[PDB]
Design a protein around this nucleic acid. Structure first.
Lengths: 227, 226, 226, 227, 227, 226
DNA sequence: CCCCCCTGTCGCCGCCGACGTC
DNA sequence: GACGTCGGCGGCGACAGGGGGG
DNA sequence: CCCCCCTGTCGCCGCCGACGTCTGTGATATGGCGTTG
DNA sequence: CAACGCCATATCACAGACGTCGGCGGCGACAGGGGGG
């Protein structure tokens, strides 16, 4: 366990400290690319095609490939123009109910953990959010990149915790083109009840215990057999 | 927009052809790495460690490195032991009410559209799912990988589109293993009632049109100047 | 310098890390007890009246003497019933105008430093305090001895740092019980005129740069020579 | 309420008698150690650390340790060097406006009341100071320790007594050298206005009566319970 | 050798403390009275003019007799008409050159020995008076009886002390409006010159040493011889 | 006004009868003592204490109370040993310059007026002593009490009178033996200037007519009311 | 103090729908 | 009406810096 | 990672406040002598 | 016809100086423990 950032929520003047944690930990085994004949792992070296020589990270300049096939180098100052890089606070913008968030924009969920000294000023805000049951659209900033996100509280029975959901930009979600539904619809209700009863035939709820990653278990058994 | 893959929702006698799109595709500008002296693209090439030279990808043996570090030679017979990967159709295993679905477990959104002209089945399934309001849990099998997913509908006004939302396994969620938040800390209710209106001082509603990425717009304009 | 402690202001939702420092360092010279016969640094032993033997710090019991002088054996668990001192927060209580604290009460002055990498909340609080011109009275706690204080802001050349001034409990400030001045003495205007003349003849303006402790400098020079 | 002084303000040939009094009495309770196991009161005995024998107060020589761990015995000539302590007078130095002394410096306060016979000069000087609104910075020698101070008047309604506020030597007060605040802090204009209602929601008037040491009163009640 | 007063020279603010001392102590043979037959001391009997019985001190009352023999009753406040009786200080009034006042009015003298802590102010005042050789007129109010006096500095070589000389009221000096003084005589100059040289015939200087008390010394010899 | 006694100044072969007068006759008001309820004077009589009997003044023992509290038997011859009282004249001893004696011992002043038929003598001594300007140190005798006095000449405008001032025994001028003033204290020049300014502010001239015993005046009014 | 993990980042690899075309 | 080529679209998996905590 | 600095005790010296001791001053109330009685 | 205004003398009453004694409180130093690096 290791936090990925350390900052304070910057709403108003509150400056409540928090420690960000990644909820979705990659339990899946990460495979490696090696060659059995030499038993030595492979490495990647980038060589200019015409030059025929390897290069170091310092000599490469980022170039944006346009539709015209023209390369333009990117300067550090131009990319560095963003002033939020030095900001280590989750700059809250406004508080909104959680019912109006489109479930399509969720990207990743992080766990917020406060500082022991100021636990009083964290649990208070969490309790207020729970009582009002509202999100809080923030401007999450990490690795010199800003990811719009919403902050919401999910009670875990014993305690309350704050978590931030990275949100896709509303312009990102692509509008669909639907030339199929334009046709007239004439459905006999006689089949409506039949279909509805078919749907209700498998009436049940979530069963997390039954939901087991079969392939992951098989791979785990295989690697155990290897040893 | 070209569908990533096309298939059908095969569950017993119920079967509808479907072409699957991607609801979201990163529109952030991507740049090609170049070398200043070259002023052109640079190509990565695999090099063997002991050999000191480039070895073809086809001559590389699958392996996994654990804590012990034993040399693992993964073949194809064990990888193909799962027959689900071959299956190009997606079946509903169970049904669950919409409320039970949590916002936590969404992974990605894929748009579903039909292929044949038998639009009766599409609208019928959309209507019954909307009325029952129970999410169709599916073991999505695409890209020869199987992941849990749920199918549902939302009202576009113009369209009653049915489409899926990938899900992750319960093993992927870490627990909040820290009792610091569990400390019994009392709070003066006056503090709560004075921070209340403070919270609502900014109260508003979702306005997706207003929100945008300032950095991406700045980069777009900057490259436009270039 | 070296911080005495590191807590954080807290009134309801608001919070801000602060790092107190000592603002009055006395450069008066501390000596050590030595004896000429052997020139060895003295050592102290806790010695028992009744039992006539050395009794350790751990084996030493605290007690109290009342008006009758009866010994009272106290216990640590009972005294610790107060939970406030455990708090590591400068729990602000109210905001009041700065001019409403007579110089009777000020006891000690302490600087403040924002702890986290970002000082936005600290700077904003300092600015609002400077503008509205209001002191903030806090229940400063330190070393398990809670002591009332007050928050005020005053610029020093380059910064608008704000400081906390400890305060005396109003019941501590005595009163001038003196029936010798309430008597009225006959006086003449010429006496007032001459008194004003003599007083204002010696009047001047504060120039602290030329005020120093002659005894301290003398001792410093004497030790330097030795 | 037992005096600690009997001198006289003397700037020239004035010499108004004054009785200095402690203006801050600590109601805090001071405890006492004891060997409760055998019921034996505790006393401290000065014992050599090297030669290891108990000694009397006279023998120990006041010794100073420098960076080299030296030891110099302070003799009588050190006392003889400064003759200022031989004076029992509050030798007024200058008269300045009261506004010229900052609250940074004030250290302790005492109340001056005169010998009953010389009340005339006492009240005349206090009245002159009050009317002309002047500080009266002085010197001060209590138990052989010369401390700067300031003499300022203060009306108490029925009576008007002048008091001496001891001052810290201007060099003693520390200077805040904090580079963190020097770095530029940027705040959007709408942010600052928000805090005004936050502080205004808690504004009040300073009333001494409300505040009281709960710890001390609880301890007093507890000990009353013990008896 | 024991003091009589503890006040303070108080004009404006100078308020210099002083302990007035007696300069004219009667060294005569202070005698006592007894009776031979009883061989014991005596005591008066306060018998009325009419009661015929001894009256206690408290019961007696004050009154005055005029030419007509009437009586007057004085109340307690009547005696306290002048508030200056309550005064407990030598309230200086003015300052005059020493040579101006005639030695006619000088009635009694006293010594002023200041309080130790007030040596500076008293020394400054004495030096000031000596430099300008200026007297000072003061209402020396002692033992409830006001009395005009005069304050000046007398050198003693070792140190300078300031004494207060009581002054008789100017109206007290009887006017010699007598006719005998008016008459004048015709006087030859030669007799004036011979008389003058006769005056010089017994020239001498101030020699109080050869001056002695005859009767007092003889009584001292007698009282030494008797016992 | 009645002269206290009449004698002469007999020094050498020069004699001049004189009429001594009380120069300083106190005008302070003397009130008697009466028991108001009695309405009469309280007459005191010498009464034996040891034997408890009324004793007349003609047998009281002239006894002393020394350190041991003994008793003294005094005869007439021993107290009559001194023959000076037998003389009823003033004896001029010598002559000394007047400016070199301080007024410390000057006790009482008495007027001298001519009693001789010949006016020549009185004016002769008056003028010669006035011109020589030398004090005439003489012995004064009165009612068995002999005290020294000095004769001087004072002009009252029209009149010139030789006049006698009593003097005290040399041992009666006590000494100011006290080390408190012996201690030497440094003087600051600025304090000296301040003292000179303040004292000079009240500097004035002595006019006899201004000063009256205001208490005596108000007592006069008070008695006048009755 | 050291000393060790986590995530943008992008080039290499691979596959399947669209629409030109037989 | 039915081949099958292409092009893009996505994913795989290695890497390069960012901090975290004792 | 730590060594510094609050905080509480202790012992010590120096200082004040009340108790006890006597001593000198102002006034009453008579004498002897100048003067009248 | 030269003893009764003015000055001691007695002391009586009364207000104040001066010396002892016990207690109260600054303060210089140490010890312990916390939370800073």
């Amino acid at each position: 366990m290791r936090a990925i950032w350390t900052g304070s929520i910057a709403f108003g003047l509150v400056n409540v400290p928090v420690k960000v944690y990644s909820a979705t930990a990659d339990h899946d085994i990460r495979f490696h690319q090696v060659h059995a004949k030499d038993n030595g792992r492979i490495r990647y070296k980038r060589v200019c095609e015409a030059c025929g020589e390897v290069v170091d990270y310092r000599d490469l300049a980022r170039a944006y490939e346009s539709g015209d096939g023209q390369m333009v180098a990117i300067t550090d100052d131009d990319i560095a123009s963003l002033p939020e890089e030095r900001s280590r606070e989750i700059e809250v913008l406004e508080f909104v109910p959680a019912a109006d968030v489109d479930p399509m924009m969720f990207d990743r969920s992080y766990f917020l953990e406060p500082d022991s000294k100021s636990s009083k000023s964290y649990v208070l805000l969490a309790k207020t959010l729970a009582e009002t049951d509202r999100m809080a659209i923030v401007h999450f900033t990490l690795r010199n990149k800003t990811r719009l996100a919403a902050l919401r509280v999910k009670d875990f029975g014993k305690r309350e915790v704050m978590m931030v959901h990275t949100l896709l930009w509303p312009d990102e979600i692509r509008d669909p083109d639907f030339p199929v539904l334009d046709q007239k619809v004439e459905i006999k209700p006689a089949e409506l009840k039949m279909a509805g009863q078919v749907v209700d035939s498998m009436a049940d709820d979530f069963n997390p215990d039954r939901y087991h990653d079969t392939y992951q278990e098989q791979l785990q058994e295989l690697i155990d057999t290897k040893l």
